[PDB]
Design a protein around this ligand. Structure first.
Ligand SMILES: Cc1c(C(=O)C2=C(O)C=CCC2=O)ccc2c1c(=O)n(CCc1cccc(Cl)c1)c(=O)n2C
Ligand SMILES: Cc1c(C(=O)C2=C(O)C=CCC2=O)ccc2c1c(=O)n(CCc1cccc(Cl)c1)c(=O)n2C
Ligand SMILES: [Co+2]
Ligand SMILES: [Co+2]
Lengths: 381, 381
């Protein structure tokens, strides 16, 4: 059931912005590790005396890395005279965010028809304002409201190239890396209490609960009208044998924040080959692979969807597989992206639900908590 | 002339420590960009609840990357009960350093016979204490005094593996990269006033001025007894046509600090091939190459030292060449290592001065200011 109750017209995930201490080093690491091309910049070389911002792209996926310069460079500016390309940016907010949380996501940006209207309606329906709508060069409107913790939901809308004041990156420094990642599938928050977080966000968006079919968490998913903007939220379950990983997150993150970003690949096998090649030479590590019993058990679970060779390829790469009543999901998780055991990345590919492919086809892999548990006890023998 | 006036016995550069916002991402970028192996760690997985510290090595060169965790993880500790592996580390100092200066060098560490004695004698001769001598697991003593700005000179001494509490890195995550870098040749500070900085440092070390043979700077070099610890210092020259790059440093760095690290390669040609291969896929960029007239002029300057093929190879890679009365220097400079136009890296190889090779053979390339200027006007034609 989908009541299509969005209170404003939402299109797609537009970008994810990381707040960094040094944007250069994070962006270059992420570019090599994920196969994303350097596409735009806003920094000293473009006249921005406030913040350094570098954009990586792979398909429709946009990762933005931003860090503050010394406030002294812009001490004479006021907001009417600012050289920042992102008017919501604040030196003090950025430094406090990074000191409190370490490296992580500041903004989940969705593209909307009308960012001023999206902001107004949101705030009229309980959203905590974070940055009022601002029109950039009469072409792009950007607005921000609080999502959870210190993460904002950012609305962007275009009259008709990333943002004004950003410049396309020079051909020489823009090496066309590509490991097959194409778009952001979903973005997941960790919170202390799922109920109040769900009520708040669903309250100002009109996003509906996405139908779902001892692990330390309860979770629910909010979705836009066409279920292409997907925002799951987790809360810890206390009192378990193994301490909840959601609670460990909240502790090391200093509270709520973005837990993982799930990136859709058009060929998860090639993506994982390419990423695993680079794990130990500057890229990303992956969680420990499931035992072979897990892949033995795949024949019964997904033998109508994956061949024996396609299953062996999953075993080669540590890929996980889960199933809805509608589709099949292949997924794998990286180790944390930075120093703290907080944010990580999920690579996914979905099979089925053709009409184009409907959002969320195959679910989010929650059946893999049980199957992993079973397979490890089965492998123990 | 070398009076060998060291006030304590100094051995060699031991390591360079960067203070970071996220040590993971800087270290992984540096590892790939410079061909340095992950060798040791001190972090949550080793019981360190205070800071994440990752060590990269290439030959004798040691780069340490450190960032603070949330203070809440260690809120119950006191210095007698600390889990930090580096007792001088302070959350507030690290955050203030990084917020003020961005990514850069906090510690220039030299190995000495006796770090307690080195500290005491230093302070008795005017050094500003920064961290008193502390004995780690009865095996290693570490002490720190102020060098310039917020950079410390760190003394380390061993009774007889990097530091106690650091663990050797797992074979799988320790990929044996190597582009030919072997040791730190020199470490260079930028200051507002060269005279008072020279007097201070030479005053508490007994380091002597290293003999030297419109560019925007004045500089001098301090050296240990065998001239293997080399610490040049720059000050800006004001009132030039082109604004001094030293002054630009001081402005963007919020004052004095480490300007560049010069890394000796045992094969500068292979190092630069390997680094330039990776410039646009996560590694380091290099300053713009000199005009072809510069390499035409190399035949007259160094034709007795480099063949025509070895010169063409310099032109291929943008390598610079300078000459002492004693030796020849090949050098090249990276673009800034991070967001701000502050710290950069120099790759060098020295030819001559065999006895082993004496320190500083060939100088520091100050003749290349004139030769670059000449060659660009010559290329203009
Ligand atoms: C993130 C994630 C998802 C996911 O995407 C997600 C949503 O998108 C929607 C909300 C529910 C939800 O979880 C699905 C399955 C997962 C994981 C996962 O993170 N992990 C490792 C956990 C782990 C493992 C070992 C020790 C610790 Cl402390 C912790 C798993 O095993 N599975 C099976
Ligand atoms: C760092 C450096 C050295 C060096 O190692 C050093 C010491 O170790 C000892 C003290 C003197 C000293 O300088 C030598 C030569 C250099 C550079 C250099 O940095 N540069 C680029 C500068 C530059 C160029 C263009 C615009 C701007 Cl704003 C700025 C050069 O050209 N040469 C020729
Ligand atoms: Co997920
Ligand atoms: Co130098």
């Amino acid at each position: 059931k989908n009541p299509k109750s969005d209170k404003f017209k939402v299109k797609r995930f537009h970008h994810i912005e990381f707040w960094c201490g040094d944007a250069t080093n994070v962006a270059r690491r992420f570019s090599w590790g994920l196969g994303m091309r350097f596409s735009a910049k806003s920094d000293l070389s473009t006249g921005n005396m406030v913040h350094a911002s570098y954009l990586l792209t792979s398909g429709d996926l946009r990762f933005l890395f931003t860090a503050p310069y010394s406030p002294s460079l812009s001490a004479g500016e006021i907001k009417p005279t600012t050289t920042a390309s992102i008017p919501s940016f604040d030196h003090g907010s950025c430094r406090s965010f990074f000191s409190s949380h370490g490296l992580g996501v500041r903004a989940v940006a969705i593209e909307v028809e009308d960012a001023e209207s999206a902001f107004s309606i949101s705030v009229a329906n309980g959203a905590i304002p974070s940055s009022p709508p601002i029109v950039l060069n009469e072409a792009v409107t950007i607005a921000e409201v609080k999502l959870y913790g210190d993460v904002v939901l950012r609305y962007v809308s275009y009259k008709a190239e990333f943002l004004p004041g950003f410049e396309r990156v020079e051909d020489a420094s823009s090496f066309p890396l590509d490991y097959g990642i194409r778009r952001l599938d979903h973005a997941v928050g960790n919170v202390p209490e799922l109920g109040p977080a769900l009520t708040y966000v669903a309250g100002f968006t009109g996003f509906h609960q996405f139908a779902e079919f001892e692990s330390g968490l309860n979770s629910a998913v909010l979705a836009s009208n066409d279920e292409m903007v997907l925002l799951p939220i987790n809360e810890p379950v206390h009192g378990t044998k193994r301490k909840s990983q959601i609670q460990t997150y909240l502790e090391h993150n200093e509270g709520a924040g973005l837990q993982h970003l799930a990136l859709m690949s058009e060929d998860i096998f090639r993506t994982l080959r390419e990423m695993r090649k680079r794990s130990s030479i500057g890229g990303f590590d992956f969680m420990p692979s499931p035992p072979p019993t897990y892949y033995q058990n795949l024949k019964k679970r997904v033998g109508d969807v994956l061949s024996d060779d396609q299953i062996k390829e999953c075993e080669e790469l540590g890929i996980l597989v889960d199933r809805d009543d509608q589709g099949t999901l292949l997924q794998i998780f990286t180790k944390p992206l930075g120093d703290r055991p907080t944010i990580f990345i999920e690579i996914i590919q979905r099979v089925g639900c053709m009409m184009y492919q409907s959002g969320g086809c195959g679910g989010f892999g929650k059946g893999n908590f049980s199957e992993l548990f079973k397979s490890i006890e089965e492998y123990e023998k």
